[PDB]
Amino acid sequence: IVGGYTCGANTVPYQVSLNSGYHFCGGSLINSQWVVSAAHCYKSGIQVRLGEDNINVVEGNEQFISASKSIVHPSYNSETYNNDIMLIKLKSAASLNSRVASISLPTSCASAGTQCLISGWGNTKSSGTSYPDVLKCLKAPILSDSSCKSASSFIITSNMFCAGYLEGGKDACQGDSGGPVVCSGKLQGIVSWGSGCAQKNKPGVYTKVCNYVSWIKQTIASN
């Protein structure tokens, strides 16, 4: 997260850290047994870390649970990143409490202008490298497709939306991938891709979750 602020320990209880010996992607807890992340975060041997703030220090509220199954969207396209969404099932149900909770799925899509909260342990520099140990937060509005496309020249699909600031300075970044984009109390997006970080006219691109609710529900019910 570039240009954000420190969230505060466990103030974003649905945020998870995917770990393979180190943090490599974010994710969101949708119920006691499932996590949603980005398909481009796919990897074998994943451990899901819940209730985390500082990812380098055991503070007491963490829950470390291995993934039993990973399901990448059947139509994920690694060339365009269309359908960049993946589901992960935990080997054992997580214990839900005030510091570890699920985030609700959308009943309807969000509209341009809506304010959202993006969070992650990704790079905090637009130029250079600096990874934080504590969770970072950023409030960003969803941009109209027209404003996003005309300014960035990005190839976007109906399964994506941009959010951020065209003037640059505030944006998600590498390391934030798979993380949540919550607006009006619902999970409306997943950190998917972008060009560099916080660059002018290059806003972040996010997977449009409201388009996958049916798939998510059916998948978790059958697995």
Query: What are the residues binding ligand BBA (CB under 6 A)?
Result: 40, 80-81, 171-174, 176-177, 191, 193-194, 197, 204
How many CA within 13 A on the CB side of residue 124? 16
Widest pairwise Cα distance in the chain: 47
Catalytic: which of 84, 102, 152, 192? 84
Which of Ca ion, ligand BBA, none interacts with 174 (beta carbon under 5 to 8 A by kind)?
A: ligand BBA
Burial 69-105 (b: 16+ CB within 10 A, else e): ebbbbeebeeeebbbbbbbbbbeeebeeeebbbbbeb
Shortest CB 132 distance to Ca ion, Å:
13
C-beta closer to ligand BBA: residue 81 or 121 = 81
171 is catalytic: no
Which of ligand BBA, Ca ion, none interacts with 100 (beta carbon under 5 to 8 A by kind)?
A: none
84 is catalytic: yes
Shortest CB 194 distance to ligand BBA, Å:
3
Tokens of 6: 């420190």
Which of Ca ion, ligand BBA, none interacts with 80 (beta carbon under 5 to 8 A by kind)?
A: ligand BBA
Tokens of 209: 């979750």
Shortest CB 50 distance to ligand BBA, Å:
22
Shortest CB 171 distance to ligand BBA, Å:
5
Catalytic: which of 37, 40, 53, 152? 40
Tokens of 174: 């590498």
40 is catalytic: yes
- The dihedral over CA atoms of 43, 44, 45, 46, expressed in degrees to the nearest 10, equals 30
Tokens of 195: 């060009």
C-beta closer to ligand BBA: residue 25 or 94 = 25
Distance CA 149, CA 194 (A): 12
Tokens of 217: 């529900």
Residues 13-52 that bind Ca ion (CB under 5 A): 52
Catalytic residue set: 40, 84, 177
Binding region for Ca ion (CB under 5 A):
52, 54, 59
